[PDB]
Short mmCIF file of C-alpha atoms in Angstrom, two decimals:
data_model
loop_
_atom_site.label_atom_id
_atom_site.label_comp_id
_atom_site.label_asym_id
_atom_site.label_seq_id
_atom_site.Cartn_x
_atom_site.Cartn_y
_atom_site.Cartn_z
CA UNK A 1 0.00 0.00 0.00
CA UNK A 2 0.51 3.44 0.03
CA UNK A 3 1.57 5.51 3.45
CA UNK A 4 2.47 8.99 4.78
CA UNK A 5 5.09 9.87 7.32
CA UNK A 6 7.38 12.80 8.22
CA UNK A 7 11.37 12.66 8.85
CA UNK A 8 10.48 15.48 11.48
CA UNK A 9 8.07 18.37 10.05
CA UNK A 10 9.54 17.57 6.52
CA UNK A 11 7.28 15.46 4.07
CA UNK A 12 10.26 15.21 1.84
CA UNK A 13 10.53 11.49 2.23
CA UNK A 14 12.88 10.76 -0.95
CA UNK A 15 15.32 13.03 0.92
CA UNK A 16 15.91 11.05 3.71
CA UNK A 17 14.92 7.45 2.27
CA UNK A 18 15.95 5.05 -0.65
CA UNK A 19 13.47 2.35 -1.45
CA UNK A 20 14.32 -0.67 -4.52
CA UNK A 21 12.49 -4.04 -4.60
CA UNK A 22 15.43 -5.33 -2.78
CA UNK A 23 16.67 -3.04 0.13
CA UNK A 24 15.44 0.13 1.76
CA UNK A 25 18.04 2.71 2.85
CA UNK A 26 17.15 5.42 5.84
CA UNK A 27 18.84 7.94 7.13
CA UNK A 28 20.58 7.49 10.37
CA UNK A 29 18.81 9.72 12.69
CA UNK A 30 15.45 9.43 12.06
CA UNK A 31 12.45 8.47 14.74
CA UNK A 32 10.48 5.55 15.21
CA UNK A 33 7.30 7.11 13.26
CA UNK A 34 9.20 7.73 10.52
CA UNK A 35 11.06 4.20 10.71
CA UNK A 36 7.66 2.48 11.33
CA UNK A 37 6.21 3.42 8.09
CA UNK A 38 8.84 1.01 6.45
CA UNK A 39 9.10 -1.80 8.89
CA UNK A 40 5.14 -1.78 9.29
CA UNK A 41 4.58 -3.07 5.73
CA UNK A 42 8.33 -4.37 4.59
CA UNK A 43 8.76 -6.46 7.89
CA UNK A 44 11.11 -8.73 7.72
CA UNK A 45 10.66 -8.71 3.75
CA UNK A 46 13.71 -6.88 2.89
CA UNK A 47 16.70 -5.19 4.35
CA UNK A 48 16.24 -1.70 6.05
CA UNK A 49 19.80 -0.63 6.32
CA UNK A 50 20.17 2.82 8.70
CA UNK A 51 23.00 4.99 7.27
CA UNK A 52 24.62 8.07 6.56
CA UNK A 53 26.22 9.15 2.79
CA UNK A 54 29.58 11.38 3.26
CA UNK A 55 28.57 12.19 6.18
CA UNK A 56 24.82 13.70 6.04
CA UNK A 57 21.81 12.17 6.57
CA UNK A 58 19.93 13.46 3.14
CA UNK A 59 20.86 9.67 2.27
CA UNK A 60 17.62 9.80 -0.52
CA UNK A 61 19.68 12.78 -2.14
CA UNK A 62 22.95 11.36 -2.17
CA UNK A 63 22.79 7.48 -3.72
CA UNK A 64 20.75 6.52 -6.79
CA UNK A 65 20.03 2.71 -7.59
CA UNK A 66 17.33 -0.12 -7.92
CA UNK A 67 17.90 -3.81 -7.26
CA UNK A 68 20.99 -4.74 -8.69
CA UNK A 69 23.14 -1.79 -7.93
CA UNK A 70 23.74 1.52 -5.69
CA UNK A 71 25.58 4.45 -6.87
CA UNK A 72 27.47 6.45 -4.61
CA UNK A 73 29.50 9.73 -4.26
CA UNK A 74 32.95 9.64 -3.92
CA UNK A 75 32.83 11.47 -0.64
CA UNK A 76 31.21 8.40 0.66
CA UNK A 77 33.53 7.26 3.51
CA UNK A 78 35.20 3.55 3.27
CA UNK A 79 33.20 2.96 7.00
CA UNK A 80 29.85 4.03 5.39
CA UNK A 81 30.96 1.68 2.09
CA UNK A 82 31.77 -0.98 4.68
CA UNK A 83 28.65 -1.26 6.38
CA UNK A 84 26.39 -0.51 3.48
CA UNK A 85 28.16 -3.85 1.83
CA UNK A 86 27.18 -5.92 4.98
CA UNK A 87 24.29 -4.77 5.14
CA UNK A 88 22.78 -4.64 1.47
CA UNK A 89 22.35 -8.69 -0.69
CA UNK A 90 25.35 -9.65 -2.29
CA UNK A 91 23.86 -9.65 -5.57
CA UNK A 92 23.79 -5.53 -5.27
CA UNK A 93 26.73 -3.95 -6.55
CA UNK A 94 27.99 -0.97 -5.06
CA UNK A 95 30.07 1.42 -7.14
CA UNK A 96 31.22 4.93 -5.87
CA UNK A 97 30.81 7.78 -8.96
CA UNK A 98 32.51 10.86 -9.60
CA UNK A 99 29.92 13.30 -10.98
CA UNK A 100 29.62 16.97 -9.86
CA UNK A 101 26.77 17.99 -11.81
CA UNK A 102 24.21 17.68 -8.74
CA UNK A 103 23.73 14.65 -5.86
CA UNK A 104 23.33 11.30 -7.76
CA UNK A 105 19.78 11.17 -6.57
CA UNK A 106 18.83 14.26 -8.72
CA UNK A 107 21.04 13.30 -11.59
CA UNK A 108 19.44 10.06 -12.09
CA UNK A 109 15.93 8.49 -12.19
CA UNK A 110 15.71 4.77 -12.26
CA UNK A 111 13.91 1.45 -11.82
CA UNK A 112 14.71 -1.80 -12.78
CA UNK A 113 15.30 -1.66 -16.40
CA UNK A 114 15.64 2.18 -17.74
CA UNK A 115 17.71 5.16 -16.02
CA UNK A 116 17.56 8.64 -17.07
CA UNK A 117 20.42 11.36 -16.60
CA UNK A 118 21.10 14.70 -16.31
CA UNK A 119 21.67 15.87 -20.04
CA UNK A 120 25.19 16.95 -19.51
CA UNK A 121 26.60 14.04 -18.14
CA UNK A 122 29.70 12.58 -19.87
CA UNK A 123 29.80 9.71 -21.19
CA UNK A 124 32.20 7.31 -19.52
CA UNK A 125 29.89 8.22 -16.41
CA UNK A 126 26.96 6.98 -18.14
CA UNK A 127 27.99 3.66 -19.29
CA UNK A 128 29.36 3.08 -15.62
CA UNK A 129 25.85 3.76 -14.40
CA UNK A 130 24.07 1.18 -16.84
CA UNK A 131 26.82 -1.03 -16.48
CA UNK A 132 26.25 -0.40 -12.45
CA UNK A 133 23.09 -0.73 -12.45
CA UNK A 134 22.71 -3.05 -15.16
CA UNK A 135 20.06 -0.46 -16.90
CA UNK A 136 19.71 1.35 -20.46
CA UNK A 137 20.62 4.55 -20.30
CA UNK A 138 19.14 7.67 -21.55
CA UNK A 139 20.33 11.81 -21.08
CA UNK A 140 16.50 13.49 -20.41
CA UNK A 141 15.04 16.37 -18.89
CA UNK A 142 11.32 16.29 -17.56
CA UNK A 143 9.93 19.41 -18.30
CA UNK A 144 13.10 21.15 -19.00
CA UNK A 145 14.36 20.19 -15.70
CA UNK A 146 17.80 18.54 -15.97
CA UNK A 147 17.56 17.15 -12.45
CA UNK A 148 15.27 14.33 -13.21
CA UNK A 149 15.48 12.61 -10.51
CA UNK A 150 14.41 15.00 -8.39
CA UNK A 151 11.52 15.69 -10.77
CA UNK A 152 10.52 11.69 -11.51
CA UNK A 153 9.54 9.00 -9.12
CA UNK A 154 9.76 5.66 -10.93
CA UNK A 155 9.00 1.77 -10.05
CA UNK A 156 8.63 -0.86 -12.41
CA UNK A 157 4.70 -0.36 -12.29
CA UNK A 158 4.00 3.43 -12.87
CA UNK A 159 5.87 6.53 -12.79
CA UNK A 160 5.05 10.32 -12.16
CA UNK A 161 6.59 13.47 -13.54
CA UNK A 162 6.77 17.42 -12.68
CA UNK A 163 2.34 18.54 -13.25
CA UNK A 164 3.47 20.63 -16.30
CA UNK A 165 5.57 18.21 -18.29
CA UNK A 166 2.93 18.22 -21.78
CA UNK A 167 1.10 14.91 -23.41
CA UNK A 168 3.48 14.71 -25.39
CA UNK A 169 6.17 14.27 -23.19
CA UNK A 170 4.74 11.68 -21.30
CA UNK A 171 3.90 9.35 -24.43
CA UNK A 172 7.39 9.72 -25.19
CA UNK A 173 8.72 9.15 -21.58
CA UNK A 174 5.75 5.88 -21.21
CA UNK A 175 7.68 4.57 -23.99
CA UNK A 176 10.83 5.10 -22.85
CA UNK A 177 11.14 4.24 -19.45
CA UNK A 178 8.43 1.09 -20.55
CA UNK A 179 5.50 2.34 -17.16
CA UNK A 180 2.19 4.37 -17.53
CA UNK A 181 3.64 8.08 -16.91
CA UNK A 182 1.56 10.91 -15.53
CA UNK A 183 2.13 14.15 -14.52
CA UNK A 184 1.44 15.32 -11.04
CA UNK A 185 1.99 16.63 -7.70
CA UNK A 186 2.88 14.92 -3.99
CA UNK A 187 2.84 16.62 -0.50
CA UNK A 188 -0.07 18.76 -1.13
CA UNK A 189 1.03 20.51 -4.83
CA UNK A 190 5.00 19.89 -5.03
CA UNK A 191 6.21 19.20 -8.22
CA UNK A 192 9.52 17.80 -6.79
CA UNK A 193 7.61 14.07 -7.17
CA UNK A 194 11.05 12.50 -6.80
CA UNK A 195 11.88 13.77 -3.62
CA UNK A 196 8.83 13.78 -1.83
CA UNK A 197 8.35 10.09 -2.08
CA UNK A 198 10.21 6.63 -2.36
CA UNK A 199 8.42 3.56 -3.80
CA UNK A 200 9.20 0.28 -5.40
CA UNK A 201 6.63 -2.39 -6.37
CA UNK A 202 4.66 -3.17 -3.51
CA UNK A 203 5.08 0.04 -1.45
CA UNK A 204 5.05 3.83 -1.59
CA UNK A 205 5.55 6.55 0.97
CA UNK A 206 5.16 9.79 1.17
CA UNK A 207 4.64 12.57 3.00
CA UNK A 208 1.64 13.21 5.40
CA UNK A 209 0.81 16.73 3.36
CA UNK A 210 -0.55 14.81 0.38
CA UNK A 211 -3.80 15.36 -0.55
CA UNK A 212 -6.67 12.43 -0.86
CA UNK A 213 -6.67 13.00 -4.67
CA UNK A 214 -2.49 12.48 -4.65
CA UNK A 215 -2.32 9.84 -2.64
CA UNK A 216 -5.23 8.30 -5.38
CA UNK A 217 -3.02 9.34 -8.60
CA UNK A 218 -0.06 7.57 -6.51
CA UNK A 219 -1.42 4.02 -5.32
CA UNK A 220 -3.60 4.29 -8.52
CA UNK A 221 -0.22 4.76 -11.25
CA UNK A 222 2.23 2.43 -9.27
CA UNK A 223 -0.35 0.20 -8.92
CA UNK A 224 -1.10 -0.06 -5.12
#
């Protein structure tokens, strides 16, 4: 299903979360409310690994990834690499990237078979990040944004994109990324869809501004 929670007063939950179909990564810091709303209805089903990315605690900022891999900044210290190794299945690669465009999580919007990336980025970085995360790759922008993954949140079921991006763009982007795209808004009109919410196949959260008729586009396009 589909829940709302708060790290603190902030509804920003793809800030402080990462969620795949194979892990879920929180911040370090966070309280039990805000933990609850992943244990409650991932129990014992996958791994919720507490951590911390170079330091900070805006963990859903700093890594991009999906089942098979995690991308992380350089800046990501080898204690935090360490544990996050332990922690995470085996079959999850973990790869640290050098890209200074923006944090990985608003450079790249993913799920388990398409990525999209900032338009800019070179291209050694983005063959390491579909051979990373085992993905095909594409440079994008949703709505003329060129952080897309701060602008897209994506599962294997659905997707949504910044409210304004036109028709046409989501046909295109459908097709692309291979999910039923719609524009929209999270947290009670934000159009920064990928970092007010995490979600993977079975389970979305948000934050607890958004609306009744949000929450509907949102269990109703990932399929909830």
């Amino acid at each position: 299903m589909a829940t709302r929670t708060q790290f603190e007063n902030s509804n920003e939950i793809g800030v402080f979360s990462k969620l795949t179909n194979t892990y879920c990564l929180v911040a370090v810091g966070g309280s039990e409310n805000f933990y609850s709303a992943f244990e409650a209805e991932l129990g014992d089903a996958i791994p919720i690994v507490h951590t911390t990315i170079a330091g900070t605690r805006i963990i859903g900022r700093m890594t991009a990834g999906n089942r098979r891999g995690l991308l992380v900044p350089t800046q990501t210290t080898d204690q935090e690499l360490q544990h996050l190794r332990n922690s995470l299945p085996d079959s999850v690669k973990i790869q640290r990237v050098e890209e200074r465009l923006s944090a990985l999580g608003n450079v790249i919007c993913c799920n388990d078979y398409v990525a999209l990336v900032h338009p800019d980025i070179d291209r050694e970085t983005e063959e390491l990040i579909s051979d990373v995360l085992g993905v095909e790759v594409f440079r994008q922008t949703i709505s003329g944004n060129i952080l897309v993954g701060s602008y897209c949140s994506l599962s294997n079921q659905g997707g949504l994109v910044h409210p304004q991006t036109s028709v046409q763009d989501q046909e295109e982007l459908s097709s692309l990324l291979q999910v039923p795209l719609v524009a929209g808004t999270v947290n009670r009109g934000s159009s920064v869809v990928g970092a007010g919410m995490v979600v993977n196949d079975y389970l979305a959260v948000t934050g607890l501004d958004t609306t009744a008729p949000e929450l509907s586009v949102i269990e109703s396009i990932f399929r909830l």
